[PDB]
Structures are given as structure tokens and as C-alpha cells.
Design a protein around this ligand. Structure first.
Ligand SMILES: [Mg+2]
Lengths: 410, 326
């Protein structure tokens, strides 16, 4: 008579069953807990609940999908979907405008009291909480332990519960499975090393990729819409190679240990966590600037990281290109004069050369020997500076009367 | 017992579902609303039940071979073998030709090729060909240079047109994975270089008639290759480029978008909303077929080669060429 009788009878009892054509797995939903089970396992559940093991599981075929904004069910095109996102308690909570004070002190302590970046993070966090989308930006919190980086994780972990992954390590990534990304709004990573590959570089795409592949054990490899947002806690060690011109990472050094503050009592740690609801309420009541979510800033620490990560040869080439003497002097070129590698006259010619962007071989070698600490041949300097960073062309120019081999910037 | 060996096939066609058994994959295929899935038998029996109210012991459907042939019809019969098509066009693939490209999209493209018509137009001729003719080009494009030049935006833009036919932001990690579905039924395959060179295998993917496809819970299977490769990199060479190279166009772009006049906030999003516009434009190109697989010695490609190639080679060549000047 009826292809869905069993569906309905189990709905009568507050269980929603379906077959998930995508995962070829029967899904089941009670009390905002979603599980996927094989058929036999369902038959075992069904038996317990109606006292009959039917040969045919009379349930609808949906596609389970983690769409936080969308309803309990919907039908894109001709396909009926069912939702795997169920909001946590503290996601369904009444807006407020004040943030709990002890929570505020944590956040202040953490951003070293800098409103700009702190407020930007709250705008990010709010957007994630409220709109529940991918930002395309990630936050790195580095600096010494006990600065409440880990506490911020626990705090958030409470608000988001199942939608957050916590303390994911390099080891978890080397695992062939990766359920730490399945149905996650926030994904926290811990770095723990003395690094100085940086396998968390793979993350950079995750930040911005529309979709992820999800290999789970005993499940099909499946591609899903990406709702991930990434926080990374680090020791001092840099966890990701940061390009100069970077748009994904906000970096926040915090070395304000909590136990060295006035306001820190014993019960503070726990007090903070008890105010999770308070901080949820606050986040729910933010008025979200949508343009500031994916904004990044050149914090002091991000700059230090870049100027150490980027190749010294690049930095030379850029100073050659920019005709930027000041850089070379900042990096101790003036030492050429002290050691009598060159006289007062030639030193004028040498500086002139950098600025004008016309550099005789014997000055180029003198410069690059002096900046780098041992002598490099023209050949090397060409192959490892001038050529790869397109500084310019090797040519002749007549200086005085003699024709001189030179590099002509441009 | 049986009167008709395909009754079930037909009844499910009545309801706009096309079911078959793939001999190649020994997996039952199913097609609704231009979404193709492959499922085990039990899973099909579960679907069938829901739709007719009867679980038959025998799945009365035709045996075809699923094949991703974009040019070819919904079905055909090479030799004596009936095939069924896994290519279904996305919305913006079926869209009406035009001759003007949306202006804000044009500014992206201009920005990206540093306003160089030659190479830019060549890329449009490539992209058009892929869009229109839907074949393997045998050429690939590398976009390197600093972030926020709209390399990533061009990927999202195209990702909207091609949808499921393009793989996005494939990394070294994905390649070290034993599976590789990022090549299964793909017209475009985008890669991110992030290191500060395992992608040399792509060299061959660009030109190989066929690929092996290891997918989880599926048989390793060999398929006709429709891949075309874009690689975003961030100043790190992703692939060893031979002096005399015919596969790679390289395009350095350091024009950050946020440093242009025309860049507003809503620009990022505006660009993506014009995906349909840019699709329409691509559909209306008149494709020079000889220029598709053309490559050029951009400034950056040369720099890459003269740094990649061995100094000892360069000495020897100067000895050979009797070239004092070098
Ligand atoms: Mg092959």
C-alpha cells in the first residue's frame, strides 16, 4: 500500500529515518543527534521500536547535506535534501550588547588590549556564529603558553560543540581520514615544535576552497561544501609559510601570561567557561560588518615572520629594482669602506650605481659579497638574483673611456 | 518467469530517473535532474522501493558503459557496445552566445595579464575552446605572482561556470593521496602551489590520451582524458620547465586588485555575479583552433628556464656557440 509507512511510524516516535543515496547509508535523527548506519544496523533499531523486521525499509531517499543557513529539509532542483546541521544550545540564544566582563578581560589580554584587531576578530567570530559561512580568513595566535589561547579554544568549543574541531595536530593530518573537517564551522589546529615540510600549508587552500574531499573510515570518500574557518595556536614556531602579500592570515602574538595579571584568580579559568552562554549571547547580538570579516592586517608579528621567511636574494633583488640604497646601508654595506675593499672615490661610484640602477660587474660582486658575507661570482649573482627576479639585463656601458660590463636595472 | 527484461528501466524513466548497470564499474548508475551517481545494488533496491513500492529480486535495467564524452550525445553505440554519458552540461554551459564581455570581468582579466592583449586573448581562445569544444588542449596556464591579483578569483569565477567539471585548489597533499577523483570527469583542473617538485607528473596529464582513476570503494579504471590544467603559484616554481617547452604558458601578475582605481568592496562579489555574462561571452567566441595549443616565451617563463637549467650546460653551450660575449 505505502512506500513510506515505516518513515511515518518512526516520526510518530520522534525518529527521522532516511536512505542517503550519496553515502548509501541509512541516516537516523533523534534529539538533534544524527547518525549514519548500515541497513542491518537499522533493521536492528527498527525491530526494537515496532517489533517487526521488514525486508523492505520503507523510508524516503534524501541527500544529507550540512547547510547551516538552510531549513531541516529542502529541494534544490528535483533533489530532496535533508540537513545534517542541527544548532547547539548556545547557538539558539537571545541577543545581547554587553560581553561578560571576565570574558572581555581574556579577549583584551589576548590581543594585548588592541581594539582594532580584537574587534575585527569579534566581527569574524560573530559572522561565523551568525551567518555560519566560510570567511576565507584564518587567525593565528602565537606566543607563550597560558596566554589563554587554549582557553579561548575551550570557550568557543563550548558554544559550537560538535561544529568545532579542537587541537588538531600534524599527526591528524597524516592520517588518511579527516573527519575533523566533516561538518565543522571552526577548525582549531595546534602547532607543537621547534621547527627552526610545514604540512599545515595544505590548510591555506582549505580556507578558501568551495569544497573539500572527506575520507572517513567505512564511509565513501565524499565531496562536501566547505564551512570551515581556521584558528591555529602556535608556540613561537611558524606553522605556515606566509607570503609577503598575504590575504588569508591574521597573526596575533600574545605573551601576556594570565597568571601574571592582577585580575587572575584561581576560579577565573572556570568562571570564563561558565560565561560561554554570556559570550554566545554577545556574539549573537553583534551587528556584522560583512566587509571587515575577510579583512587582514599586517600585525607586527606577521611582518617579522615575512621578513624572515622571504629569501634574502629576493630582498637584494628588490633593493636593486627599487634603486634603494637605504636598504643596503641598513644591511651594513657601509662596511665596504671600513675594510678598504674600496676607496672614498669608488664608494661614491658604488652608491651612485645602485641609485641610478646601473651597476658595474666589479661593484655588483663587491655589494653581494658584502651583504652576504662571502664572494659570489657574477655568474652566480646572475643565476640566483638578477635573472630569477628579473632585475635587469647584463650589458656594456662606457664608464670613463673604458667599456664596462654592467647590470642595467629595469 | 519474465515478460520484459527492461520494465523497471522504463517505469523509472516515466518518473525522470535513468537507471543502468555499469559493467565497467560493476556498479549501478542512476541519473536524475542532471546529477549522476553510482550505487551498489542494495542501495538501488532501496531507491526503487521508495519509487514503486516493490523490491524486485531482479533489477530489470539495461547494461551500458558509462563514459564522460562531452561532445557525444546522451547515449551511443561504438562498435557493438552501448555507452551512456556521464557528462551533463551545467546551467551556464547551456547559455546564449554574446560578443561583449562583462566590463568588471574584463577589468579582472586585463589586470591579470597586465593589460597584454596577446596573451590574454590567447587565454580566452583556450578557455573558449575548453568551454565550447570541451576537449583536452595539451597546454596549461601557470599564473604566478603575489596574492590578491585575482588568480584565485578567476578560479572561483570559472568554478561557477564549470561547476562540477572543475577541480579547485588541488594541492601536493591531494596528489600524495592514493585516490584521485580530482581528475574524474573534469574539463578544468586547478592546482595551488604553496611551497616556499611532485607536480612534474602533470606534465604528462596535460597530453596523455587517458588517465587511471583510483576512487575509494570503486575499481581502478582507465578513462579518456578531458583535463586542462591551471596552476596558481606564489612565486615558487611549481614545475621543472625545459628550455624548449610546449606545454606551459606562464603569466606573472603582481597587479594587486586592492591597489587599482576600479576596485570597490562589491567588486569581488560583482565579478562572480557576472559568471553568466562571462559564460555567454565565452560561448560566443569564434575559436581559432590553431592558437589553442600555442605557447609563448613570456618574460617569466624565460627567467624560470635560465635559473632551472644547469650552469654547466650554459658553459658548454657558450663553448659550442663559440660565444665569448656570454
Ligand atoms: Mg595514459
Amino acid at each position: 500500500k505505502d512506500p513510506l509507512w515505516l518513515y511515518k511510524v518512526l516520526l510518530t516516535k520522534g525518529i527521522e529515518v532516511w536512505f542517503d543515496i550519496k553515502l548509501e547509508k541509512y541516516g537516523i535523527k533523534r534529539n538533534n543527534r544524527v547518525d549514519y548506519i548500515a541497513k542491518s544496523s537499522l533493521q536492528q533499531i527498527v525491530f526494537e521500536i515496532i517489533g517487526k523486521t521488514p525486508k523492505n525499509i520503507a523510508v524516503p531517499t534524501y541527500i544529507g547535506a550540512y547547510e547551516p543557513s538552510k531549513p531541516e529539509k529542502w529541494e534544490e532542483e528535483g533533489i530532496k535534501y535533508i540537513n545534517l546541521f542541527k544548532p547547539t544550545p548556545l547557538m539558539k540564544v537571545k541577543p545581547v550588547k554587553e560581553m561578560p566582563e571576565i570574558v572581555k578581560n581574556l579577549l583584551l589580554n589576548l590581543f594585548d588590549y588592541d581594539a582594532k584587531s580584537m574587534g575585527l576578530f569579534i566581527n569574524w567570530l560573530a559572522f561565523i556564529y551568525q551567518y555560519k559561512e566560510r570567511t576565507g580568513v584564518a587567525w593565528i595566535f602565537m606566543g607563550k603558553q597560558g596566554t589563554g589561547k587554549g582557553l579561548l579554544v575551550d570557550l568557543l568549543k563550548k558554544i559550537f560543540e560538535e561544529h568545532m574541531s579542537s587541537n588538531i595536530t600534524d599527526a591528524n593530518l597524516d592520517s588518511q581520514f579527516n573527519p575533523y573537517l566533516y561538518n565543522k564551522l571552526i577548525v582549531h589546529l595546534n602547532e607543537v615544535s621547534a621547527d627552526n615540510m610545514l604540512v599545515k600549508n595544505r590548510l591555506k587552500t582549505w580556507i578558501t576552497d568551495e569544497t573539500l574531499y572527506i575520507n572517513r573510515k567505512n564511509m565513501k570518500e565524499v565531496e562536501i561544501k566547505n564551512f570551515c574557518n581556521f584558528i591555529i595556536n602556535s608556540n613561537e614556531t611558524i606553522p605556515v609559510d606566509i607570503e609577503d602579500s598575504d590575504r588569508r592570515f591574521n597573526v596575533i602574538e600574545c605573551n601576556n601570561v594570565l597568571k601574571e595579571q592582577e585580575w587572575w584568580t584561581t576560579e577565573s579559568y572556570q568562571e570564563i567557561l561558565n560565561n560561554a552562554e554570556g559570550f554566545a549571547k554577545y556574539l549573537a547580538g553583534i551587528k556584522v560588518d560583512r566587509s571587515k570579516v575577510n579583512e587582514v592586517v599586517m600585525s607586527e608579528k606577521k611582518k617579522a615572520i615575512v621578513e624572515t621567511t622571504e629569501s634574502v636574494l629576493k630582498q637584494i633583488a628588490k633593493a636593486l629594482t627599487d634603486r634603494d640604497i637605504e636598504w643596503f646601508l641598513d644591511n651594513g654595506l657601509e662596511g665596504v669602506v671600513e675594510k678598504n675593499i674600496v676607496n672614498d672615490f669608488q664608494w661614491e661610484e658604488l652608491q651612485e650605481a645602485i641609485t641610478t640602477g646601473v651597476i658595474p660587474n666589479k661593484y655588483l660582486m663587491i655589494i653581494v659579497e658584502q651583504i652576504l658575507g662571502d664572494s659570489k661570482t657574477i655568474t652566480w649573482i646572475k643565476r640566483n638574483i638578477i635573472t630569477p627576479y628579473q632585475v635587469g639585463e647584463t650589458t656594456v656601458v662606457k664608464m670613463a673611456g673604458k667599456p664596462i660590463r654592467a647590470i642595467v636595472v629595469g | 518467469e519474465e515478460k520484459d527484461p527492461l520494465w523497471l528501466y522504463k517505469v523509472l524513466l516515466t518518473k525522470g530517473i535513468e537507471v543502468w548497470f555499469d559493467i565497467k564499474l560493476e556498479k549501478y548508475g542512476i541519473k536524475r535532474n542532471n546529477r549522476v551517481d553510482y550505487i551498489a545494488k542494495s542501495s538501488l533496491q532501496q531507491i526503487v522501493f521508495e519509487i514503486i513500492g516493490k523490491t524486485p529480486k531482479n533489477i530489470a535495467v539495461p547494461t551500458y558503459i558509462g563514459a564522460y564524452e562531452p561532445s557525444k550525445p546522451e547515449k551511443w553505440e561504438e562498435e557493438g557496445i552501448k555507452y551512456i554519458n556521464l557528462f551533463k552540461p551545467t546551467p551556464l554551459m547551456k547559455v546564449k552566445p554574446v560578443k561583449e564581455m562583462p566590463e568588471i570581468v574584463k577589468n579582472l582579466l586585463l589586470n591579470l595579464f597586465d593589460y597584454d592583449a596577446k596573451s590574454m586573448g590567447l587565454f580566452i581562445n583556450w578557455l573558449a575552446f575548453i568551454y565550447q569544444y570541451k576537449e583536452r588542449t595539451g597546454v596549461a596556464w601557470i599564473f604566478m605572482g603575489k596574492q590578491g591579483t585575482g588568480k584565485g578569483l578567476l578560479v572561483d569565477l570559472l568554478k561557477k561556470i564549470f561547476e562540477e567539471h572543475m577541480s579547485s585548489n588541488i594541492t601536493d597533499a591531494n596528489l600524495d593521496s592514493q585516490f584521485n577523483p580530482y581528475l574524474y570527469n573534469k574539463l578544468i583542473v586547478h592546482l595551488n602551489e604553496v611551497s616556499a617538485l611532485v607536480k612534474n607528473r602533470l606534465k604528462t596529464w596535460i597530453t596523455d590520451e587517458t588517465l587511471y582513476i583510483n576512487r575509494k570503494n570503486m575499481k581502478e579504471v582507465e578513462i579518456k582524458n578531458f583535463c586542462n590544467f591551471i596552476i596558481n603559484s606564489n612565486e615558487t616554481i611549481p614545475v621543472d620547465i625545459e628550455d624548449s617547452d610546449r606545454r606551459f604558458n606562464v603569466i606573472e601578475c603582481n597587479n594587486v586588485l586592492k591597489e587599482q582605481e576600479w576596485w570597490t568592496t562589491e567588486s569581488y562579489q560583482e565579478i562572480l555575479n557576472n559568471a553568466e555574462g562571462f559564460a555567454k561571452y565565452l560561448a560566443g567566441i569564434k575559436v581559432d583552433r590553431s592558437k589553442v595549443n600555442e605557447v609563448v616565451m613570456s618574460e617569466k617563463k624565460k627567467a624560470i628556464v635560465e635559473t632551472t637549467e644547469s650552469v654547466l650546460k650554459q658553459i658548454a653551450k657558450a663553448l659550442t656557440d663559440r660565444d665569448i660575449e656570454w
